[PDB]
Structures are given as C-alpha cells and as structure tokens.
C-alpha cells in the first residue's frame, strides 16, 4: 500500500480521507483509507492500550483471567490516557512487555506528523500526490510525502495461537457482537469467549455534502481499546484486520496481537 505522511505546518480519518478525496480535483471514496497514525519527533505513536495501568512509577500490562469460564480483567487502578511508541506497541502485541516505565508513556495537536495508509486501486494517488507538495489540510497547510512501502507493523508474523487480542488503532464502528461475529467469519474461525477492554463509546459524526447536513451519528470503539479472544481452534492471527463500518474512511484498523 501507499504510505502517506503529512507534515503539519475521530473525524481524523474523515479529515484525512476527505483531504485526499479533496486534493483530487484531477459515502466512502473509491480508494480505501486503511488507517492513520499520529507522529512526533519520536515518530509514530499510539493510544496506550486500555489494559495497561499506571502504578508505582510504572505502567502494568494486566492480562485476563477466566472466571466462571468467563474472560475477565483483574480489578486494578484507573486507566490513564497516554501514548506509546511504535516500538513499545509491537512489544505489547507480542505480549513481551510486562510493564513500561512511566517516563516512556507519551502524554504529549500538538502534533508533528500524521501518517496515512492507503490501498490505491489504480486511482493513481501515489504518482500524482508523489510530486513533492504542500497541500491544504481540511485552512491549515501540510507537506506531503508518499512512499510505496508498507509499514512494518502491517507485516509481522504473529504465531498461530488459540489466544489472540485485537488492538484498535482507529475508531471501529460496530456493536461488540457484530464485530466478533465479523471477526469469526473473516478468520473463518469460532470464538469461545471474548473480552473487550475499553472506555465508553465514541460519538463520531461527519458532514454530508449532498444532503448538506451533518451525517448520522455512529458509535465507535475508542482507539487503544483491546479485544481479547479465545478461539476454539488454532488461528493464524493476522498482523492487522479491518472491521466495522466506514472502512475506506480509515475506521476499524485493528492490529493483531497474542497473549
């Protein structure tokens, strides 16, 4: 896929998608906005997973226990909003970090870069936007670079395992049941149990140009939310998977993990 970073000098996905959508003088679009990432001097960053809680100058990754045959999370301290490096998250997704020093968590738009991942079905976005450019953000201006290289997170070889988690990089729009159900199908597998660790539903609304009024309100699982799953049988957990509504708008980017 094309990899589009902006240098700036939710409706985040919508804004980005529209922007691209909008750039092309020359309702989802034809192309698909897989997802987006926030950027800083430290590169890409992601909302801190909801199962990582601060304590003792440290953030503890807490894993589920199966109570009454039911997946659950041990009673712990409140979630503290934050961000983590792409480096840290990958460790997380492999269940290979037991904790992160507090200093590392990134409380710090107030933003330096925004990354766009796009599947261009011969819309010729790469060559056209490829021209080194400064483009109008949907007002503010940005510098645009485009690379044909897909991000490392996207290509990872997770093991094949019965226990997988899905971390939502972007707001995913769906009821829990539909999502797991949609999941079961795409992986063509059956899920014995699942636990969703998340904050209260996010209200996402966007403009309808033709109707010329605000779009119907939808409720999305907030980013950083994690879905733990116990499959009936061994499944090759994908590096990432798109779920829920408004996919081509950058929604429903869930990154694969294990536990």
């Amino acid at each position: 896929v094309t990899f589009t970073p902006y240098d700036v000098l939710i409706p985040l996905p919508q804004t980005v998608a529209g922007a691209i959508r909008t750039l092309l003088f020359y309702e989802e679009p034809e192309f698909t906005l897989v997802g987006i990432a926030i950027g800083t001097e430290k590169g890409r960053i992601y909302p801190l997973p909801f199962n990582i809680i601060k304590s003792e100058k440290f953030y503890k990754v807490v894993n589920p226990g199966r109570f009454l045959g039911k997946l659950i999370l041990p009673p712990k301290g409140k979630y503290k909003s934050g961000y983590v490096t792409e480096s840290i998250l990958e460790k997380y997704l492999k269940g290979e970090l037991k904790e992160v020093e507090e200093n590392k968590v990134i409380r710090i738009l107030r933003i330096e870069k925004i990354y766009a991942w796009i599947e261009d079905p011969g819309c010729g976005i790469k060559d056209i936007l490829s021209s080194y450019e400064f483009l109008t953000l949907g007002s503010r201006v940005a510098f645009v670079e485009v690379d044909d290289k897909t991000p490392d997170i996207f290509n990872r070889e997770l093991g094949s395992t019965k226990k997988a988690l899905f971390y939502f990089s972007t707001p995913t729009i769906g009821k829990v049941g539909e999502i797991v159900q949609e999941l079961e199908k795409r992986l063509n597998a059956k899920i014995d149990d699942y636990l969703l660790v998340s904050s209260r539903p996010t209200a996402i609304s966007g403009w309808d140009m033709h109707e010329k009024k605000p779009k119907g309100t939808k409720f999305a699982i907030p980013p950083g939310s994690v879905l733990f799953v116990e499959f009936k049988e061994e499944v090759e957990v994908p590096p990432y998977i798109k779920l829920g509504k408004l996919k081509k708008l950058g929604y429903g980017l869930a990154l694969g993990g294990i536990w």
Binding site: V62, P75, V176, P201, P214, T217
Partner: protein
Amino acid sequence: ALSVKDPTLLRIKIVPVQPFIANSRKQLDLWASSHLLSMLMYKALEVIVDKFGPEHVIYPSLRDQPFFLKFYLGENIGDEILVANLPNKALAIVSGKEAEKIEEEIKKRIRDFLLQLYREAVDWAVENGVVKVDRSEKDSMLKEAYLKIVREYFTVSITWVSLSEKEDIYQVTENAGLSDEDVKKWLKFAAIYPLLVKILDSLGERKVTEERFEKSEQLKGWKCHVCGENLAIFGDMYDHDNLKSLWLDEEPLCPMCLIKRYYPVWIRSKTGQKIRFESVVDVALLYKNWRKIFDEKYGKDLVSKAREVSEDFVKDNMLVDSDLYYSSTWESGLSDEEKVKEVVDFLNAAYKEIGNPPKYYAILVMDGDDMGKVTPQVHVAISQALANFSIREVRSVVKDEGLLIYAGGDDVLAILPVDKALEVAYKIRKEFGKSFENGSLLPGWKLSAGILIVHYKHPLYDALEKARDLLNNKAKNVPGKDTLAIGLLKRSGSYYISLVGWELIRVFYNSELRKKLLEEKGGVGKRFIYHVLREVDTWPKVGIDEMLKFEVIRHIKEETKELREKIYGEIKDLLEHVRGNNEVEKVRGLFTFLKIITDAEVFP
C-alpha cells in the same frame, strides 16, 4: 437478616455518569443530571426492596435515603430531597433463582421510566413554548428515532455470584491475577466476601462494556446544542436556521437533553421542591453576602430602570437573569437604548459603595481514597456510616453556603462561592475523619478533593473536566493522597494549580500571614509573591531558607522584627503541608496557592 436460600451477591452499575453531567450548559442541567442518575439507581433499587426490602441492600444503606423516605414510604422530606445521595453502584444479597428476573426487571423498570419522562417532557416542551409547534406535529416527536435514543442511552448492568458454592481459594485466586496478597485473605483457616466483591466488579465491568456498545445508529440531521451528540429533535426535518427557530433561546434539544430541561419541573411537581440557585452566578453572588446587601440597598430600584429598558427583561420585581447584575452584561452582549448608560453608570456607582461584583465561583469535587477498608455485616455498618455522613454531615456543612448537588458517601460534588470553598472542603474532610474516628497522625480513611475556581462565563462541560482532572490526576497521584488540588482558571486563560495537605487550610487560616494579606490594605510588600516564585524557578544558590528570610525582610517598627519572625515562622509551617517532591516544588505550591487566594479579580 442473613438467613436465606441460595443467598447471592448482586451488583448494579449505571452508566454513563460524568459524560452525562458534563453535557450541561447550565447549573440546572448539571443538577438535573446528577439528581436523575440517583433516581435511576432508586428505581433499580426498588425492585430489590419490593422483593426483599432495604436490609438486603448492603450498599448504599437505604434506611435513611430521603428518596427512600419520600418515594417508598411517602414521608414528607422538604428541600432535603434536592440533594442526590445515591451513587451509581450498589450491591445486595438475594436468592439465586429470582436474580435473573431482577436483571430483566431493573433494565425494564428504568427503560420504561426514561420513556415516561420523555413523553411528559414532550407535552411540557410543546405546551410552554419550548418546542414551539402546532400540536399536530407532536406525533412526530414520538417516533422510533427519538424513542431509541432514550432506551439506549443508559446502560444499567446487573451481575451476581453464588455466595454458596464449592470453593478452592487456589483456583479462585488464580483466575483473577492477584499474587503476594494471599496471607490476609488467602489465609482462611477456621465467606471470602472481600475477595468475592472485587471479582464481581471484574465480572460487572465485563457486562457493562458489552451492553453499553449495543448502540443503534442515528438519522442524519442537526445535533442537540447542549449535548452535541444526538440528533436534535426535528433535526432531520429542517435546515439549521429554521430548526433553530422552533426552539426557544435558539437551542435545539435532543431527547436526552430535553428530559434534562424538563426534569427540574417534574421533581417540583413530585416534591414541590426546587434548588435555590439555578445559576452559577447565583452561587457566585453569595460571596460576602454581596448580593443580599446590594439587592437590598439598590436591588429595590434596579428593576424599574432595567424594567424601563425592557418589559421582557424581568418578571415579579426580580431579574430574569442574574448576569444582569454585571454592568458588563449591559455594556455588551445584550440579547430602548438610552437607559443603558444610567444603569451601567448606576451599577458602577453601586460598585463604588459596596465593592465590585464576584464573577468567580468554585466547583468542589471530593472522592474517598482509596476505598474501602478491606464481614458482610461489617460492610453494612461502613455503608450506614457513609450514608449518615453524606445525608446529614455534608449537608449541615454546605447548608446555606452554596449548592450541594451530590453526596454518595465518600464522593461529593458542590458549587460554592470563592469565600467558602476552602472552609467547606476542610470541614467536610474533618467530619469525614471523625465519622470514622480515624486518629492522626497517620490516618486513613483518607479523602482527596479538587477545587476549580472558574469565571461564570466559562463553559460548564470544560469546568467539570478540569475539576475532575484536579481530583483524579493531581490530588490522587500524590503519594498518600488525602490531598486537595486547587485550580484557578482565569478568563484570560491562565491556569494555576496548587496541591496541598488538608491542615494547610487550618494553618493558613489563623495565620498572621493570612491576616497581613487580608489586612493587606494598607498593604504588605507588593511583588512579595512574584519575587519568591522567581527565586524558585531554580535552586537559590543562597538556599531556600535564606531567600525566604531575605524576601520576608524586603517586604513586611520594634514589632517589625517580631512580625517577620512570625511570617517566616508561619511560612516554614505551611511548607510542611504543601505537596511536592522537593522543597522547590513546595515553595511554588505554597506561593502559587497564595497567588490564588489573593487574586483581586477573583476575591473583590
């Protein structure tokens, strides 16, 4: 009680809480949101009471809840009733068989209840000119689009566990991941109630999360102005301008925010009770009894001049809006003209004699850290105590000093005028302390609070976010907690934060220092505070004590030597009660604090 078949632990949780309250443009909305929420628990609690009665509700202790008195026993209660004393979590002991029925019923009981309010709200809105439309159109307001919003908005989650079950602590402790904490409860060699509860939460949190995401999509159209999230009623039908027209005050309203506007009147009909202050300005003006005195001295006249300006400006010899007290309101933002000058000038003259009007008020949030004191009966006594503290102790403190909105036990939400903020928080803290007879020096029960001082023009939702931030993010991140976090947000946008121990209120009050600042005019050295803060930008080479000593001298004849001793002495005392990892952090905190309580614009 305690004798039953298949006793089961049942837990109830209601959401959303803070997000709901935050969606308030006015104090009245804020109050309604808090009150309504408690009511929902009550409805939910009714089911258990009907089925088993109060004593089977461990938390909260029902026996004295006014709601309980005035809705289950029809006792007469008075303005006591306005305060929301019911939290959004509860647990009872009940039979296993009837439990699932309880789950269905509560969900339904609240669901039906919300639906009523919407409908009574609909009639109300259309009649009194809130919605301004041909009653023919009324049928439109009851369509599924709007009904669904009301049904779906709140998730009340019910969960339960068998109190009689085959038990292995090895296995039970195992599924929940909590090691190195076994001896106190791993050790049972002579039922696991305390551990049992915590799992319930873990279990409860699983259900609430699923159930709160089962949320239907909405139709296109303009959103409620207050909440900004749900389609404004008639939102689908009209263009924005015309739609703005159907609504009084130009505020289109979704269902869940419409119920908010109606809710106040509904309690009144039910209880003939209303809160004294519908506005923050109403609470702001309490400061120095400034309003009492002014309305009385000039208040009498003020309307006719104002009345002379507009017929619709006021009713009943009373101003419609309290912000009319501020000349600035006249000066600009009004929404025939000669009168303006004399009033403005009239009011400015008024300020001359009495002093300027307070435009600042305080939000007080307090929470109990960290609950509880980890036997079902032991739990009950604690609950009864918490209920007693909340219902009576807190009420007596806030009584007549401002607006007490919510007291769920450990937790509190109050709106106070600046002059009584510190006074009240400390008092509550003490009462809380005595009520558990905790003896210092080394207490817990501990309690933390957040005090946000905001300009009246400041958006309510934001004030609430910040105030909660102070409590959770500042006060409770302090090791040992039991802290008070004060934030002064100024219309300029300048935000000042000070974290302090509780006794600091005590020490500073009754300090000569306070007196000099209070007896500041004729004043104490100006820039005293700026100068000290400047030296704490970095470690004074001289050292902290010297600089203090130094600065104390620069600002303050035989007595002058005696006075500086005291001030320097008093300052040294306070720093003991200012949070901060280092002496430098403490000095800023103390002097930042001084900066706060001494701001002329905040404390005329």
